[PDB]
Scaffold this active site. Structure first.
Site, PDB file in Angstrom:
ATOM      1  N   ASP A 101       0.835  -1.198   0.000  1.00  0.00           N
ATOM      2  CA  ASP A 101       0.000   0.000   0.000  1.00  0.00           C
ATOM      3  C   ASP A 101       0.870   1.249   0.000  1.00  0.00           C
ATOM      4  O   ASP A 101       2.012   1.218   0.486  1.00  0.00           O
ATOM      5  CB  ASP A 101      -0.905   0.031   1.226  1.00  0.00           C
ATOM      6  CG  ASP A 101      -0.133   0.309   2.499  1.00  0.00           C
ATOM      7  OD1 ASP A 101       0.997  -0.220   2.615  1.00  0.00           O
ATOM      8  OD2 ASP A 101      -0.644   1.059   3.369  1.00  0.00           O
ATOM      9  N   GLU A 154      -1.049  -0.300  -4.550  1.00  0.00           N
ATOM     10  CA  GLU A 154      -1.929   0.849  -4.547  1.00  0.00           C
ATOM     11  C   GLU A 154      -1.044   2.091  -4.667  1.00  0.00           C
ATOM     12  O   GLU A 154      -0.219   2.363  -3.787  1.00  0.00           O
ATOM     13  CB  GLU A 154      -2.757   0.870  -3.260  1.00  0.00           C
ATOM     14  CG  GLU A 154      -3.585   2.133  -3.057  1.00  0.00           C
ATOM     15  CD  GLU A 154      -2.863   3.190  -2.218  1.00  0.00           C
ATOM     16  OE1 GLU A 154      -2.608   2.929  -1.016  1.00  0.00           O
ATOM     17  OE2 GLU A 154      -2.549   4.273  -2.764  1.00  0.00           O
TER      18      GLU A 154
END
Ligand SMILES: OC[C@H]1O[C@@H]2O[C@H]3[C@H](O)[C@@H](O)[C@@H](O[C@H]4[C@H](O)[C@@H](O)[C@@H](O[C@H]5[C@H](O)[C@@H](O)[C@@H](O[C@H]6[C@H](O)[C@@H](O)[C@@H](O[C@H]7[C@H](O)[C@@H](O)[C@@H](O[C@H]1[C@H](O)[C@H]2O)O[C@@H]7CO)O[C@@H]6CO)O[C@@H]5CO)O[C@@H]4CO)O[C@@H]3CO
Ligand SMILES: OC[C@H]1O[C@@H]2O[C@H]3[C@H](O)[C@@H](O)[C@@H](O[C@H]4[C@H](O)[C@@H](O)[C@@H](O[C@H]5[C@H](O)[C@@H](O)[C@@H](O[C@H]6[C@H](O)[C@@H](O)[C@@H](O[C@H]7[C@H](O)[C@@H](O)[C@@H](O[C@H]1[C@H](O)[C@H]2O)O[C@@H]7CO)O[C@@H]6CO)O[C@@H]5CO)O[C@@H]4CO)O[C@@H]3CO
Length: 587
Positions: free
Chosen positions: A278, A317
């Protein structure tokens, strides 16, 4: 090769001729005097001092008597220096949170990724991901206690299988001191959090997901630095892993190795099938604007991972638009397999949030996603990040009263599962939880108690969507090839009706029609490519999910009547606030 520093450092079990014991290994380039405490050592540094090696950097000492099962810490003087009781960074398990000491345990065995688990990871596969916070999926009813790893093996695993997901995605299971970080602020990078049991309990849990035919995606945080409990900062007295906004220093080959190993560690020694990183944007930004040190590190890892554990994939992400995150490193870079399509999430939610009567002006929010579809290999996510901090539940974003909200939600799922890209749904989305996600409580399973209700309807729909999406290759084979998607009606803005086709390699076509206003559309004629008998295989308005049961009600045969510059046409009932999937029946 110098590649797996967890196989040699840490706290292993070795023999020194007949006499058995525990071959310790730490890492400090400066330090001056580091030794070993614990229960085999009365927690005093002058019983077992440790000897350095000057070339590499590893202070060590075999110890004949300390077994797998006793607590310990380390004890060092530093660059000058002070007295610090440092924790082993390669602690493969950690004590409970009294003092947060380490524990002497070996490497767990070793898992060979199967060919079926590799096959479930590839671009042509159906990929539906159930994303779960192990600490708040479910809790024991009487005392609000966490379920253990073994209890999750019995309850989360079968529930995910039955619901039809192919993948389970865990928020970080690094040991970490604070629940409210959800796992994104870790201390023990090599240790499965003791919140849910031992490390072997967690390994048992992965074999169970595997036994059920699930791949396990692990959230991996090489880009968040341990800021709590003094664990990894000013360690040896100098700045090793830390730099000189308390970020990592991916500089030295032994901060690299630490991280590269940790990716290898989960995949090889637990059986983890995929890693998800992430915030790559916070990793490679905040010379140029960039952080060229971190760009090299990702680029590197994803190539190393691609040749060592050739079957296990990575996902990322990235909250800007760094180009080619999911494109090979040689040019563009990053080299992940998949990327979360946040743009799609923002665009479609914005569309869903609109009062249906205003949708005609924001058609662009649904059609834009095709443009940049083939710039990345996309995961359509409906994540945890989307349902906390006042952002509301996915259900509460919908306009209308109760029934309208639910029908809206069903149509959006209908559309999402049809749209090009892999799928990811966060826990509680599947039964339309009313409240935001609360990491400190169980999900609202109470909604599913009692008589059959609208939440039962959504849960049923998610399972049918999962099962229908798997099965028909048209829905998942060609997500990343323009051949796999073709508009049939892109420009009905007025009525907010969008139709498109999905296509497999054999060229079979599945027609997806969404009606995004509560006006029922009868005799809606549109052009098609493959004339013949056509039949509904999915209908978000089915009374099976508490819709009005509006639909085509049987086989529907097309007409040679031009529509949208096409020779043959279907004329169908489009249910209100609803998507339907049609298939061609063989002749
Ligand atoms: O406390 C003694 C307890 O020890 C052992 O519990 C383990 C267990 O394996 C894990 O659950 C974990 O505990 C976690 C919880 O899972 C976590 O959620 C949190 O718990 C808090 C709760 O959120 C909150 O509801 C409340 O808990 C109350 C609870 O309402 C009461 O039921 C009462 O609990 C008593 C039990 O009735 C009784 O069985 C026994 O429990 C043992 C248990 O046998 C064993 O497995 O005694 C407890 C009294 O403690 O009172 C509790 C208050 O604690 O408050 C808690 C705390 O905020 O807390 C822990 C996180 O560490 O780990 C524990 C121990 O390692
Ligand atoms: O800002 C992006 C874009 O936004 C608006 O586009 C709408 C469009 O108005 C809608 O009709 C729909 O587009 C659909 C089409 O209906 C459908 O046919 C298909 O589109 C394909 C086209 O057939 C084909 O032309 C090709 O497009 C190329 C093409 O070489 C260029 O047009 C170029 O597009 C750029 C434009 O020059 C520029 O105007 C702007 O595009 C706007 C557009 O102005 C506006 O109407 O930027 C784009 C940059 O791409 O490149 C594309 C290839 O990238 O390929 C397309 C794709 O299959 O599918 C589209 C998408 O659903 O929806 C869009 C988006 O809201």
């Amino acid at each position: 090769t110098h590649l797996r520093p967890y196989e040699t450092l840490g706290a292993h079990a070795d023999t020194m001729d007949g006499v058995t014991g525990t071959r310790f290994s730490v890492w400090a380039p400066n330090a001056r005097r580091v030794s070993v405490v614990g229960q085999f050592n009365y927690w005093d540094g002058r019983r077992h001092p440790m000897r350095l090696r000057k070339e590499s950097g590893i202070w060590e000492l075999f110890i004949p008597g300390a077994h797998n099962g006793q607590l310990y810490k380390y004890e060092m003087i530093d660059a000058n220096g002070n007295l610090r009781l440092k924790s082993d960074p390669y602690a493969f398990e950690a004590q409970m949170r009294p003092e947060t000491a380490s524990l002497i345990c070996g490497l767990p065995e070793k898992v060979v990724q199967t060919e079926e688990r590799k096959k479930a990871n590839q671009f042509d596969a159906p990929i539906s991901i159930y994303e779960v916070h192990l600490g708040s999926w479910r809790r024991h009813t009487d005392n609000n206690f966490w379920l253990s790893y073994r209890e999750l093996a019995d309850q989360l695993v079968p529930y995910a299988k039955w619901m039809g997901f192919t993948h389970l995605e865990l928020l970080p299971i690094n040991e970490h001191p604070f629940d409210g970080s959800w796992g994104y602020q870790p201390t023990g990078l090599y240790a499965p959090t003791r919140r849910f049991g031992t490390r072997d309990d967690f390994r048992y849990f992965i074999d169970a997901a595997h036994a059920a035919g699930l791949n396990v995606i692990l959230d991996w945080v090489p880009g968040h630095f341990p800021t709590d409990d003094f664990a990894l900062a000013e360690f040896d007295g100098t700045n090793l892993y830390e730099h000189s906004t308390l970020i990592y220093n991916y500089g030295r080959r032994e901060v690299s190795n630490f991280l590269v190993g940790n990716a290898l560690y989960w995949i090889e020694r637990f059986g983890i099938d995929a890693l998800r990183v992430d915030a790559v944007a916070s990793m490679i930004y905040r010379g140029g604007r960039e952080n060229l040190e971190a760009i090299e590190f990702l680029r590197n890892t994803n190539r190393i991972l691609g040749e060592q554990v050739s079957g296990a994939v990575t996902m990322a992400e990235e909250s800007t638009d760094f180009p080619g995150v999911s494109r090979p490193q040689d040019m563009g870079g990053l080299g992940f397999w998949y990327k979360w399509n946040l743009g799609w999430m923002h665009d479609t939610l914005d569309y869903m949030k609109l009062d249906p009567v205003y949708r005609q002006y924001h058609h662009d929010k649904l059609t834009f996603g095709i443009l940049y579809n083939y710039t990345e290999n996309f995961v359509l996510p409906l994540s945890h990040d989307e349902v906390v901090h006042g952002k509301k539940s996915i259900l509460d974003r919908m306009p209308g009263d109760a029934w309208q909200k639910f029908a809206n939600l069903r149509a959006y799922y209908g559309w999402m599962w049809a749209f090009p890209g892999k799928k990811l749904l966060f826990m509680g989305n599947e039964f339309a939880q009313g409240r935001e996600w609360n990491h400190d409580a169980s999900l609202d399973w109470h909604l599913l108690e009692g008589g059959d209700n609208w939440h039962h309807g959504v849960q049923r729909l998610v399972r049918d969507l999962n099962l229908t999406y798997r099965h028909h290759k048209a829905m998942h084979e060609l997500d990343f090839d323009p051949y796999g998607f073709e508009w049939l009606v892109v420009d009905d803005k007025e009525r907010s009706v969008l139709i498109f086709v999905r296509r497999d390699k054999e060229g079979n076509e599945i027609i997806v029609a969404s009606n995004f206003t509560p006006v029922p559309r009868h005799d809606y004629r549109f052009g098609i490519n493959q004339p013949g008998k056509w039949r509904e295989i999915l209908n978000t308005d089915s009374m099976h999910y508490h819709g009005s049961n509006a639909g085509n009600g049987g086989t529907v045969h097309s007409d040679e009547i031009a529509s949208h510059g096409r020779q043959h046409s279907l004329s169908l009932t489009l249910p209100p606030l609803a998507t339907i999937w049609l298939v061609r029946e063989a002749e």
